[PDB]
Symmetry: C9
């Protein structure tokens, strides 16, 4: 097991959802340094050190020390970085056709998320590695309908829509990123 | 084979925060979050109800410290610590994820139905207080259903006739958050069962 | 009687009314630590200790102490918690029908509010109990109308709407919550 | 009821905990309820006299003025053994609402009404022990109505006419009212204590 | 003459003009502690003490003291208070009629402004009096028009609108308020 | 003859309506310039700066530094603020159209009020205060022709005038200074 | 008769600020000022160009003080003052003030024109540094023209013919501001000449 | 290898996406001082020194020093600079034609991004070099459709749109900036 | 070569883009004090001194000074100033005509940007020079189209639009400004 310290990884995408959404709602989750710490945890051996999160821990230790009137493990490597970018439509498109009286159509869009992870040495402060990974986010819509006349009338509609969970894609990106960092570390080795 | 625990464990939880960065869309107020700010209550009541575990407050800590100031003053008696700390946050929220619906209209009786699913994710981390090492962590995800059903009639006589009926249901996102945090707490409690920490 | 201290119970619902309303107008009242303090007061025996509210009291005591040139009771239990959640439509629906020429219709929506109360020990700082309770908020509209032709013409409309007072439902929730807190203490007993 | 006697009551602030604002067309910054309590309340306590409101609004200017006085000379400040606290608890609408109307050729007429609710919380607190001696919630309701009548007639030429009237009870008055019954309730409640 | 010191009287109406107006513009002027100071000035005997306004005066005195390298009169009573409330439509209404081809119509609205003034003693800090006064604000619009056919065509329009000056009504309320305060003080008498 | 003026601020609490930006005031922020030049142009008076004072103090810091000589005071201080702004107050207009020549006209009035107060520097007593108010005219005129031939003919002419609110502010501040000086003649202090 | 000056005068100008409180209307961003923030540059270059006058910076002063911190630091030599200080601000802005336009259309050739005038006012004050007394002040006002011209043709043949030509001009509010500050500086300079300050 | 310390490179474009987008959404990524740090990392010889990022490193070292009751490498040159500008439409255009009953059309837009990088000496604080580079950002849309009558009716639509990843163009720009910087440094040296 | 120190040249235009754009988006880049630093660098003789930018430099030197348990060159001149103004339409206009069935049209707008530079003496704090320069910003649109009837139908459309890169024009203005300052120094000297 190797002790890894990670404090914060930002959303540097600087992006927000368009209308109808609230102009306050980010296009990307604020959750990394959770995603990342659990990615390091689940890829074990790595032993995540918290530091989120550090203030509370320090308070708790203050309470402990107060109750009695005993040390805190460090990390030789630190992971840093942020969420590099988000956009759309990137690649997007769709088709459709309507004949009397049955129409049908379909649409799709792709999005991009990029992430940067950096392994930095704690002793020398040198950056031992850094990587950019980018996943893509699918969205699609399918519709079919029927408009027919008799005389009286008839009509019908069916439809389905899917959005890949940006949070899941982020998780994917940070995981493949950690895989890459570990792999890169194997040729170092530091281990 | 067989596992076994021993006794109650004091757990301190300060903030489990909303890292979703999300807010409801229009018509809603752009200030209204898509997700409750209420965890570190949901979680604290999960730990209280999942006993044996003993939540240590710390929300919440300052008011207590003040009250202790009043006590110490009025008399002119220590404060128990927690050996584990739970942390984490609400990892994410989105929509439509999966969504869709169908409908049909024949003269003169129409009907239709629609539905949407949403997702919320939560992260819980058990961290050791002495060494500051993270002992465990889990990501959990619930989904949030919404659906609408409508039926109607347009008919001519000569005179005329029409009618409408409809029903809608939205799963309570707060309940879904709670459900998620329960799933996470169950997961953590078993991992500790195989450890044991106890 | 037991002295109970309550400082802040907060709105953690993070919700605001939709349009036409002002985006600054909360979906839920800010009034708890009053509603709750009066709930504890009214179920007495409990003796709410203020602390809202505390600063003014401290100033007033400064003034007294100056004018005289006599202590301040504490509480062994503290109540905490907040308003956990709010939403809508949750469940909603309605029906209606129109035949010549008399139409009628009706609608309803239900909402939810949840609350958390926690009894915490002041001495050791341990949480003695915590409970979540949730009420629901009814709203409905009724309309009836007539459209008739003669030659000349005739029409008429009547309607009524009712919305349950979200504030009252909050009071209800906090009250039932006070009941649950009171009960678990009975087997404690403290 | 009855005075004695006079009791010094200090009130610093009673605040709007309603968190409510007027809807469109109004400005989203415009509160649904007045910020004027701790005036309304001070005058309510005053008008029910005996009570002797002690200011504390307001205290900063008074202390500055005393600085000026003390400066001109190069004499104390009475305190209150009770403190009144509390806030504006809640506001809404439509709560209860409705209306009717009918039109025959060519004379139409109609009327509508809405009720709103305002709630207040007052708490009498002991200054010496810091104990809350009482707390009360009162709620008034706010009436509004609109009336219209009209005529559309044809001759051939044409004729039309309209008349209308609307009244909205002054929310500020209902707040004052609420705090007034609240002061009454507080006084009565104190009557059996008695502390006074 | 009696020296009266007045520092702050602020807008507690929490109200703002509706659309089309800018959402930042108050429904009520911020000018009180002037209107009041000039009202007391005009009601003489009273001698307004500034204190607005005080910081600048203190600076100026710093400069005076600096140039020379003579005291500052106080007030035994202080006036306080604020603008209590504003609303609309309160009472409002109107009529109108149109016959071929001449129409005419009229409308009116009333608004309300309330004020609170309090006389407080500077020595004891006791409130010697407090009063709430409320004026109302009139507005009306009148129109007349003609639509006629010849064959060709004819039309005409005339209209007038008047809105009472909210600032003036604030002044009216603050003045009548001053009358109430003096009136109450005379039976004291101090 | 030395007059010191630090503050005159916008207490109108008003902003322009739509189409304008909600950040744009209905009234200039410029007084303590208008007023200082009004006192200057009305001489005898000698404006003492103090806007504006901080920069000067820095400059004197520099002078004093380069050398390793005093600063004149004022026995009277002028104070006050912009009391109010409104519209439509009085407004109206007419128009008529006959085939094919139409014409029409409209007008609106506004109000601006200002308060000036002379305050004594030694005793801090207010020696005088006045409210003065100007009014602001706006008008529009249009004329047009719609005619058919068979083909067609049409034409339009129009003119609009808005009195410069800033200028009206200047006017109010000047008449105010006139009044203050005049009343001062019977004091006189001068 | 005859006047006369002597020598260069050191003038310090810290801030000349926008007191207009005005912003462009829609379509523009509500954050966009109706008037430039650039005076105390415009004015400083006006004083620089009307030389003899020696603008003293002080904008601007902090960076200068830092650079001198660096200089003084590297060596281990004084700082000139200004005998007069100029102050003032942008007093006001508006529209339509005077505005209007005409136009006519005959078959099938129409034409029309429109115009708007705006105003900017500026205040400059020469203030004495020693006694702090104000030696002079002026209010000046420029006006800002805008106009549009259009011509068009709608004609029928059978088939059809149409045409459009148009031109618009807006005077540069920044130019008008500069012009205003120039007129104020000119006024102040004659006034000082019969003073003299020299 | 030369040790290069880069603290922050900032977005000085002052630009945000237009409607429908949120008025809070930057038109340009905030991600540089990652992009640039990884560009210098990928261009070796260079050894990026962090400094992002520095506070956490310092805290961690505090913890380490606490556990023991061992020094920190510096950089002799520092890279600075920022994202200079962004705009559109800059160049834009498109064509299209529709005949009975088959229509088709296409659009395209270009955007610009500029970047400034500056090599500064740490000892003397002198700017050894500074360069501005600018990439451009392609976007295009294509549609084709058929509207026909029979008697009954028939219609169909197909379309595709591609938008170049502004983040990529930013990366490309910062890389080209690095190339210029290295070129300038070699001629010094 | 002369050492020149430049800290801030700011956007004093107070202007922001109109609708559809975000109300937070400046009409003008925030990039000057880079543009200016690269203009001075490119005009050598001159040696831009950083100072942006200074805090990181001082931190780095803290790291250096700590690692060893060597001075920092000053500038006798400082360049200051700001972006003085931005506007539109200023001059704008256009023509167009349509005959059956072929129409065509074109329109254009001009914008203005002005910049102010000031050379200030560091020793006496006196302003040695200041200049205002202003460039103008062209934008134009061209379109041509055909609507024809047969019976059947026909239509076609082509169009092209260009916007001069406001960032480029600012660069231009700041450059010409640097020229003016250099000349102004030439007769000084």
């Amino acid at each position: 097991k190797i002790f890894v310290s990670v404090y914060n990884i930002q959303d540097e995408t600087g992006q927000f959802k368009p209308y109808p959404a609230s102009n306050f709602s980010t296009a990307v989750p604020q959750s990394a340094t959770a995603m990342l710490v659990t990615a390091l945890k689940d890829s074990r051996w790595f032993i995540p050190l918290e530091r989120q999160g550090l203030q509370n821990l320090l308070n708790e230790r203050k309470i402990i020390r107060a109750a009695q009137e005993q040390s805190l493990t460090a990390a030789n490597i630190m992971v840093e970085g942020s969420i590099i970018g988000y956009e759309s439509n990137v690649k997007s498109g769709g088709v459709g056709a309507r004949y009397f009286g049955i129409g049908a159509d379909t649409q799709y869009q792709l999005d991009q998320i990029a992430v940067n992870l950096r392994v930095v040495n704690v002793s020398t402060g040198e950056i031992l590695s850094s990587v950019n990974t980018s996943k893509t986010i699918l969205s699609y819509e399918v519709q079919a309908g029927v408009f027919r006349f008799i005389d009286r009338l008839l009509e019908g509609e069916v439809g389905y829509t899917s959005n890949e969970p940006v949070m899941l894609c982020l998780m994917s990106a940070i995981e493949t990123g950690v895989i890459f960092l570990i792999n890169d570390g194997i040729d170092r080795g530091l281990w």
